[PDB]
Homo-oligomer: A and B are copies of this chain.
Amino acid sequence: EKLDHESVTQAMQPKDTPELRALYKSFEEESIIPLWTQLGDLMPIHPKSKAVPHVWKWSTLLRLARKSGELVPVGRGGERRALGLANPGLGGNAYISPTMWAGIQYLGPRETAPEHRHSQNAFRFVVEGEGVWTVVNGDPVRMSRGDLLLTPGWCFHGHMNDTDQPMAWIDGLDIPFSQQMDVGFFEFGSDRVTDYATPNFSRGERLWCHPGLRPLSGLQNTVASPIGAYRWEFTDRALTEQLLLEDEGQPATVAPGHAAIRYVNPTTGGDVMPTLRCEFHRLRAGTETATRNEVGSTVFQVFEGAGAVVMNGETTKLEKGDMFVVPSWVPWSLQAETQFDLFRFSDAPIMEALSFMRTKIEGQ
């Protein structure tokens, strides 16, 4: 119970003879790697990611996406003017964590990003901006400040900026899980979008965004949410109500002065997509969350307010639009200077689906 790989006796250390050396040479030849030279690495005491905790500043992400907007045309080959946050610990891979791409995308005036689909699951989130529609399976979906937009695996999507002003948002994808696991399919669709109309709300939303109500034409459950946009007005209202209910002495908040919602698939009550969990948190000025260790990785974008994240004991101060990653099992807490709003995503549905999830909370 108390020993680690540092502290235990290495009892499988063979005599370094010419025959041993011949046996090891013969291993390499035959595509064999013995367990005993390697045990501690393959099976650590607790998760020890190669991904490192890290913070990206929004002013930095903005300046670089804007410069990218001058110098690089968006179109067919590369598909998107999207800049992926790359974990310094992940050997040059465009992965914010071992499971997830997190990135900034920029669409300049009147630009179109052509239609494609991929098994990989995706979502858009907007800290600031208006002007872009993303057309998901032919259904135009407005993008605005505070909106979560979904694009589940295997759905066609392309984006067009219907205005003379640029917008930026963030993408989250299971791109990295999907590459390492070999699950990727990809298909090119129309070079434009298939509908340039700009309805204020999409068809999915007009069918599925009535609370506690389900169309009779939609009685089959789905693996991904059929809600295309989760609009800021509902998220804001939910969070306010939880805070109001707290004031009124009623249970609601997840911890004192900590309001939070999880975005869900209305057909099951579960996660928006099989691999990706989205949440939105609002902390009262002064709130400090209890330190957590969680299996798998999570990313936050600050939506509004000022505060700090503490990861491994290290406080970093945070401003609007800043992003950070918390690798598997790294202890973390948030601290609200003002009322602190944040957008969150994680690979938790993968961890929970496979029974790998664990949670340590300080104070219990």
The 8 Å CB contact of A67, one of B23, B186, B188, B353, is B23
Q: Which residue of B lies closest to A94 (CB)?
A: B33
The 8 Å CB contact of A43, one of B186, B253, B264, is B186
Would you call A315 an interface residue if the criterion is a C-beta within 8 Å of the partner chain's C-beta atoms? Answer: no
Q: Decide: A266 and B268 in contact? CB cutoff 8 A.
A: no
C-alpha gap A15/B20 in the complex (Å)? 57
Q: Decide: B71 and A15 in contact? CB cutoff 8 A.
A: yes
Q: Decide: B34 and A206 in contact? CB cutoff 8 A.
A: no
Q: Decide: A27 and B83 in contact? CB cutoff 8 A.
A: yes
C-alpha gap A252/B206 in the complex (Å)? 10
Q: Known contacts A71-B19, A263-B213, A356-B119: does B182 contact A42 (CB below 8 Å)? A: no
Stretch of A44-52, A127-135, A157-165 that contacts chain B: A44-52
Q: Decide: A355 and B213 in contact? CB cutoff 8 A.
A: no
Q: Known contacts A12-B73, A12-B74, A13-B77: does B64 contact A32 (CB below 8 Å)? A: yes
Chain A count of residues within 8 A CB distance of the other chain: 144
Q: Which of A327-351 contact B (CB under 8 A)?
A: 327-329, 347, 350-351
A interface residue numbers (CB < 8 A to B)? 1, 3, 8-15, 17, 19-20, 23, 26-27, 30-39, 42-49, 51, 54, 56, 60-61, 64, 67-68, 71-88, 92-94, 98-99, 101, 103, 118-120, 153, 175, 177-188, 203, 206-217, 219, 221, 223-225, 227, 230, 234-235, 237-238, 241-242, 244-245, 250-254, 260-269, 274-275, 279, 295-297, 327-329, 347, 350-351, 353-356, 358
